[PDB]
Chain length 171, copies 8
């Protein structure tokens, strides 16, 4: 049921089969992030011929439906897919007694507390890991990573959301 | 017995021989994971002409047969293969007294405890390596790596599955 | 509310669909910042056919509308988008007790204190992290990062602007 | 007499001279491992026109014979060779008092104990190197690397096989 | 009002839209610095058809005006822009108690004292940072970086010029 | 006197001038070892049109003459050269008190003790460098590197052969 | 006053506009130093059609005029420029108490003592930096770097020439 | 007067203007060392159409003369140059109290003792640098690097030759 939704600053990548002039307007060498479609602060992106596409708050399939229908005015029965070349809009903050603290992007793949620990290089040996602070939507909560690995208990793990702060205090 | 099954977030790579417009819509320079077909949360990926293809829970051979049969409506006798450009959906967590703790992808190649330990940069000197905790499907066991390398004992080794947690405690 | 506005020294990337002679005058291999359009000190960049375009103080959508309308004199119904290949004009300075002190670009994505700290390799152990100095428009405040990660407090966090200095003193 | 045999998960690379549409269906830039033919768990790979090719347990020349004959139905007198782009199926495990322990792939080139030491960064100074444990096919054996280099004696060296574990105990 | 002016040794990059034989005479792969126009010691560069172009002391727009007018003899209504591929002519020297001392190029983007600190890896902890020496045009001056970050005072910061030496003495 | 002879596992690179379909069947981007012709355990490599070519025990000039003569049946006066893209078959083992111990390939260029020591990152400070053990064809000698660098003595230096072990003991 | 003059071993890069067969005989991917024209010990380089060109002791503008005039016999009004892909012929030696001692190329850009010191990773803490030895044309001087960075003194700085040795002694 | 002469194992690079089928038989992407002409132990290389070219003992211009004349039988007035893509045949050995000891290739650029020190990372502080051993053609000699930099005396520096050993003893 986990569904990512595009936010401002994301870079989207639109594939139009049989139309490399649309899929790769700047050639095949540059990465999709360096050639993709920037989402503007008002939530729209420009796509050729169809104009502005409202994409903030929408899923990839919903954007796909939107773009495919409007491109049919200019392209015969267009075959289009949409994904994100750069997840720049949404992010969680993992700080404290993890090896490599910092921001972690919210993407189409779910980011749980456990998932976030690893991308942060893992806990340090002075981590108060039975006592981790999760701040979600102005609420606070205490999390125990010790029981997640010693007892395999998933009832302490949580899914991370845009803006969440995960703080591992020193001991 | 072991077979990988596609999950949401995986990036698939579809090769259609004699059809570079299908195999490489964005050109041939970018990597297959930067141009491949994302698997959506509903378990489908979009493919041109044939539309949405349900790939979650299916094997690569099954997806290939599915895509090949439906693509035959648009291409005469299509020659298709499918593999995975990015294993993003399923994963096991290796933590504790290994030199490189963290997240390890579940792929088409089997991943055993011995594979995961070796892939984690090896054990540390302070690893309780006769007493490793494996959490699988909400049920913990005790695993002894010592006997696996000193006594040739495979009967403590295990194949790892999605969601599994392998914890190597200190001593 | 937040919107980036182009400044002198920025390198812009203009995509004109169906016109690779405009999108990639130097070919498709070099990066967009190594081939993009420099913004001159008078606030203009040169664009072919239409000449000098005033871009400083304008948003990307406004520059796009400007270029599209003037390019229509030379191209029938031109499909144009503009983004930034290099954010060279505006910047905030993060110094003091962070692991990576220095210069951080102001871009189309908002940069908050929490973003800048996380982007600076994190605080150090000797950071006076309840007493961080923010200089904005010639007026200093006191900022407490401690409460932001221990108490969920966003009311001390701030969005950073061009010229801002964030100083994290020792303790 | 040493002969490698393909296993599941290997990635094979098929060269068909005069037919780049077969040799490089995804272009010339991506590596052969990222464009090659995956061996499925049932031991088969897909090859265009001829269908499924049973390759597990077979040598490269035997696969070459198989593919060449069947491609003759679709290609005039095909000139085909086959090699492995990725040795993913078979592996030996070298752990203990070697500098860089871990898995080493079994390939078409013989891997002896001495060959395996080097890819593992060599022995450490605390290696009980006169007393190395080799586990092969459920048998154990003691190996002396000291005599291999001090006395040049090859009667302690051994050829490593899929699944073998080579453990160098601390002293 | 800050304006860079080309000096000898700079490498310039001239873009002539619709004329890749002029923009990329050595192809699209090599960087603009490795294919650009060297400014000779007498202040001139060679450009095809028009001959020698006096560029030292001139701004980019002024060089653009010069080249565009003369190319009109050989190219219909040429659309030309000019930027610098390599800033090799002008430089400031930052030495002393900065982490990474050395030369910093003078470019089209203003380089202030504060800007120069960061590219030098920041100050060291033994920097006499309230007592920094700036040598500009044979004059000396004392600069306090402490007040720039503690009090946000820009009245100590300075713009750096070609040949300037910024020395941060040990304490 | 010294000449390399091809062994099983070597990857050969065959250049046929005016025939890029033969020289580069997989394109021109991939390296020659990633596209070259593998030498099989029976000592043959496959080459198009002419079939299997016996290359083990033969020199590059001999393989060239062999391939050229047989290729003349299919190509008028073929211009062919052969070299080695990967030296995988033959090798000497350098271990003990060198900064980089391990495996060193036997190639078309002679490899002497002095070459191998220098290629191994140099001796260590605790090397018994007047008493180095060379094992060649099942017969050990004593070698003094000290005299080679202090006394100009080449009469202790040796050319290394496949299977040779060079052991530098501690002191 | 300063002008570089070509020496033996330099690699020159000749651009002939509208003639990629001359500019890039080996294609456009390889670097200009890997494809450029070597200067032979007799002081000449070979150039197509016109044969050997004497380039040693001549400036780039002089070589350009020479090549352009002689190439006009084979090409109508040739547009030619020449620069240096590799500065291999002339060099100054920086040794002693600098963090990166060694060899520094003499190029078209002037190299002063202050340039060479900054390019050498900076002085060390034990450098006798008021007493640096410059050997030029067989005549040593004493140079004080201290006054150059503390007192704004350029009258101790020097331009370095081929063969010069700059020695920074300890203290 | 310093002249390099080709030896066995060198890789030569032959440029034939207007004939990319000769200059780049394997395409433009691979380096000249990976596509060049190997010199065989008998001193010859193969070049298309003309056959074997005796190159050992010859200079580049002499090889150029040889190849150019014989290619005229097959190519109208061929424009040919020759350089070395890989200096593999001749080498000097620098060991002892230099930072990075090892082999240094003898090339077309003269390698003096001073030149060899730098490529070796410079001397260590325990170098008996007033007492360096040079072994040249079975003769020994003592060299003082101290006087080369302290007194600028070139009468101790020497040109290094193939096979020379330069040993810097510990003190």
């Amino acid at each position: 049921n986990y569904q990512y939704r595009v936010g401002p600053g994301d870079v989207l990548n639109v594939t139009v089969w049989d139309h490399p002039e649309l899929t790769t307007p700047a050639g095949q060498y540059r990465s999709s992030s360096d050639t993709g479609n920037w989402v503007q602060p008002d939530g729209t992106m420009f796509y050729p011929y169809i104009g502005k596409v409202h994409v903030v708050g929408k899923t990839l399939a919903e954007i796909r439906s939107d773009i495919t229908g409007r491109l049919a005015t200019y392209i015969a029965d267009p075959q289009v897919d949409v994904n994100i070349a750069a997840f720049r809009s949404q992010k969680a903050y993992i700080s404290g007694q993890v090896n490599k603290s910092g921001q972690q992007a919210i993407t189409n793949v779910p980011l749980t507390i456990l998932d976030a620990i690893n991308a942060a290089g893992g806990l340090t040996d002075t981590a108060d890991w039975r006592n981790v602070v999760l701040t979600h939507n102005g609420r606070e909560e205490r999390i125990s990573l010790q029981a997640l690995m010693q007892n395999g208990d998933l009832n302490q793990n949580r899914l991370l959301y845009p803006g969440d702060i995960l703080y591992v205090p020193r001991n």
